[PDB]
Amino acid sequence: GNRHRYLEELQKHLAITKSLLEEIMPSHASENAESFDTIKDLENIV
Amino acid sequence: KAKFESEVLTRLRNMRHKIKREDLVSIEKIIADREREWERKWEKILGKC
Protein backbone atom coordinates (compact mmCIF):
# COMPACT_ATOMS: atom_id res chain seq x y z
CA GLY A 1 0.00 0.00 0.00
CA ASN A 2 0.78 3.50 0.77
CA ARG A 3 4.27 3.96 2.46
CA HIS A 4 2.75 6.25 5.09
CA ARG A 5 0.27 3.67 5.89
CA TYR A 6 2.99 1.12 6.13
CA LEU A 7 5.10 3.20 8.61
CA GLU A 8 1.91 3.72 10.67
CA GLU A 9 1.33 -0.12 10.88
CA LEU A 10 4.99 -0.65 11.70
CA GLN A 11 4.81 1.96 14.47
CA LYS A 12 1.98 0.08 16.10
CA HIS A 13 4.14 -3.09 16.38
CA LEU A 14 7.35 -1.23 17.37
CA ALA A 15 5.39 0.40 20.14
CA ILE A 16 4.71 -3.07 21.54
CA THR A 17 8.30 -3.92 21.12
CA LYS A 18 9.34 -0.86 22.99
CA SER A 19 6.92 -1.75 25.83
CA LEU A 20 8.18 -5.36 26.08
CA LEU A 21 11.82 -4.28 26.11
CA GLU A 22 11.15 -1.82 28.89
CA GLU A 23 9.57 -4.58 30.89
CA ILE A 24 12.19 -7.31 30.28
CA MET A 25 15.30 -5.23 30.80
CA PRO A 26 16.65 -5.32 34.42
CA SER A 27 17.98 -2.18 35.98
CA HIS A 28 21.64 -3.46 35.75
CA ALA A 29 21.51 -4.95 32.30
CA SER A 30 24.11 -2.55 31.00
CA GLU A 31 26.55 -3.47 33.84
CA ASN A 32 26.18 -7.11 33.32
CA ALA A 33 26.84 -6.66 29.63
CA GLU A 34 30.26 -5.02 30.44
CA SER A 35 31.47 -7.94 32.66
CA PHE A 36 31.87 -10.46 29.73
CA ASP A 37 35.57 -9.63 28.93
CA THR A 38 36.61 -9.68 32.53
CA ILE A 39 35.22 -13.15 32.98
CA LYS A 40 37.13 -14.46 30.01
CA ASP A 41 40.40 -12.95 31.31
CA LEU A 42 40.04 -14.74 34.62
CA GLU A 43 39.70 -18.12 32.98
CA ASN A 44 42.90 -17.66 30.91
CA ILE A 45 44.96 -16.58 33.92
CA VAL A 46 43.95 -19.71 35.90
CA LYS B 1 39.59 -11.95 41.52
CA ALA B 2 41.34 -11.71 38.07
CA LYS B 3 43.83 -9.21 39.50
CA PHE B 4 44.65 -11.41 42.52
CA GLU B 5 45.16 -14.58 40.46
CA SER B 6 47.37 -12.70 38.14
CA GLU B 7 49.50 -11.75 41.10
CA VAL B 8 49.71 -15.43 42.16
CA LEU B 9 50.91 -16.39 38.63
CA THR B 10 53.55 -13.65 38.72
CA ARG B 11 54.75 -14.88 42.17
CA LEU B 12 55.15 -18.46 40.89
CA ARG B 13 57.04 -17.30 37.80
CA ASN B 14 59.31 -15.05 39.91
CA MET B 15 59.99 -18.00 42.20
CA ARG B 16 60.86 -20.38 39.33
CA HIS B 17 63.07 -17.67 37.67
CA LYS B 18 64.82 -17.10 40.97
CA ILE B 19 65.46 -20.89 41.33
CA LYS B 20 66.63 -21.45 37.70
CA ARG B 21 68.68 -18.18 37.10
CA GLU B 22 69.99 -17.55 40.55
CA ASP B 23 69.94 -20.45 42.86
CA LEU B 24 70.78 -23.43 40.43
CA VAL B 25 73.49 -21.44 38.52
CA SER B 26 75.29 -20.71 41.78
CA ILE B 27 74.97 -24.30 43.01
CA GLU B 28 76.07 -25.88 39.73
CA LYS B 29 79.18 -23.70 39.65
CA ILE B 30 80.14 -24.81 43.15
CA ILE B 31 79.56 -28.49 42.24
CA ALA B 32 81.66 -28.21 39.04
CA ASP B 33 84.58 -26.54 40.99
CA ARG B 34 84.46 -29.16 43.59
CA GLU B 35 84.42 -32.05 41.12
CA ARG B 36 87.38 -30.55 39.20
CA GLU B 37 89.38 -29.89 42.40
CA TRP B 38 88.85 -33.37 43.44
CA GLU B 39 89.79 -34.97 40.06
CA ARG B 40 93.01 -32.83 39.96
CA LYS B 41 93.95 -33.74 43.50
CA TRP B 42 93.79 -37.46 42.91
CA GLU B 43 95.14 -37.44 39.48
CA LYS B 44 98.29 -35.86 41.02
CA ILE B 45 98.48 -38.41 43.82
CA LEU B 46 97.70 -41.51 41.61
CA GLY B 47 99.57 -40.39 38.31
CA LYS B 48 96.31 -41.60 36.45
CA CYS B 49 92.75 -40.78 36.21
From Swiss-Prot, chain A:
Domain of life: Eukaryota
Compartments, record wording: Cytoplasm; Cytoplasm, Cytoskeleton, Microtubule organizing center, Centrosome; Cytoplasm, Cytoskeleton, Spindle; Cytoplasm, Cytoskeleton, Spindle pole
Function according to Swiss-Prot or TrEMBL: Contributes to mitotic spindle assembly, maintenance of centrosome integrity and completion of cytokinesis as part of the HAUS augmin-like complex.
Subunit: Component of the HAUS augmin-like complex. The complex interacts with the gamma-tubulin ring complex and this interaction is required for spindle assembly. Associates with microtubules. The interaction with microtubules is strong during mitosis, while it is weak or absent during interphase. It is unclear whether this interaction is direct or indirect.
Family to which the UniProt record says this protein belongs: Belongs to the HAUS8 family.
Name the record gives this protein: HAUS augmin-like complex subunit 8
Residue numbers of the full-length protein present here: 270 to 315 of 367
